Amino acid sequence: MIYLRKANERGHANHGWLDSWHTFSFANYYDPNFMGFSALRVINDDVIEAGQGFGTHPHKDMEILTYVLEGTVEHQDSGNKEQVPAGEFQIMSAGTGIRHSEYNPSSTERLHLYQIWIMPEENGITPRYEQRRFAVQGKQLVLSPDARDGSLKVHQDMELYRWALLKDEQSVHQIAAERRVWIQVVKGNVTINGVKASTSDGLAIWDEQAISIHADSDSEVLLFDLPPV
Ligand code: NI
């Protein structure tokens, strides 16, 4: 009751300025199996060569999360112009509609980030854009529906932890009722409920009463506790 999406079976789309790998269907990459997982609809693993970026485009009715891993990303709303450096997340629920344009401010540095898309619990909510700096050990709480423990709000019944584990560490994750979970291995090597997973792999667990996660090495993962069906 555990599916392993290996890194090299993500949809690949290199564009010259943007190399990108898609955990799910997205743009000119379509597979009916790899559609979505619960509310996780998009996990994109993007490298954006120095100086390049997406032009002025419009999102609507979607809670979008960016997690920057290397370099920096400038973000220009319409009216923001705040940056986001390596290590900080940045959300933006869109609801009624918005128009933004993201780019790589360095001319010497590649930008590498995760692009995450979670279907919000209702459309037409008010545009909003939080952006925090959420370490080296521990399971951080990045997204939650009430912004508890210093997390950010996400307009969906789901939490997102940035678990950072040291070699041979092992914690359990409570797992709720009919809930589902996605692990996205950021770096390293882990073992979840028997299933090994390395950098950029993703595992999708459901109909399971608990999650044992064994850091086969120092490794960071992203955990999506996601609601049922
Ligand atoms: Ni965008």
Compute, in angstroms, the gap from residue 194 CA to the centroid of ligand 1. Answer: 36
| Rounded Cα distance, 13 and 30, in Å | 11
Ligand 1 center to 115 CA (angstroms): 9
Experimental resolution (Å):
3.1
- 3-state secondary structure (DSSP) of residue 21: strand
Task: Tell me the one-letter amino acid at 78.
Answer: S
* Maximum alpha-carbon separation in the chain: 48
3-state class (DSSP) for residue 7 = helix
Q: Are strands 111-118 and 40-48 parallel, antiparallel or unpaired?
A: antiparallel
Task: Give me ligand 1 centre to Cα 157, in Å.
Answer: 23
Q: How far is the CA of 120 from the centre of ligand 1 (A)?
A: 16
What are the structural domain ranges in the chain? 1-10+135-229, 11-134
- Does the domain at 1-10+135-229 match CATH 3.90.550.10? Answer given as no
CA of 81 to the centre of ligand 1 (A): 14
Q: Which phi and psi (to 5°) does residue 149 adopt?
A: 45, 30
- Asked whether this chain's domains 1-10+135-229 and 11-134 adopt the same fold, the reply is yes
- Show the tokens assigned to 6: 């290996």
Query: Ligand 1: distance of its center to the CA of 77 in Å?
Result: 10
Report d(CA 3, CA 200) in Å as an integer. 14
Q: SS3 for 150-217, per residue?
A: HCEECCCCCEEEEEEECCCCEEEECCCCCCEEEEEEEECEEEECCEEEECCCEEEECCCCCEEEEECC
**Residue 31 token pair:** 């597979």
The domain defined by 11-134 carries CATH number 2.60.120.10: yes
The experimental method behind these coordinates is X-ray
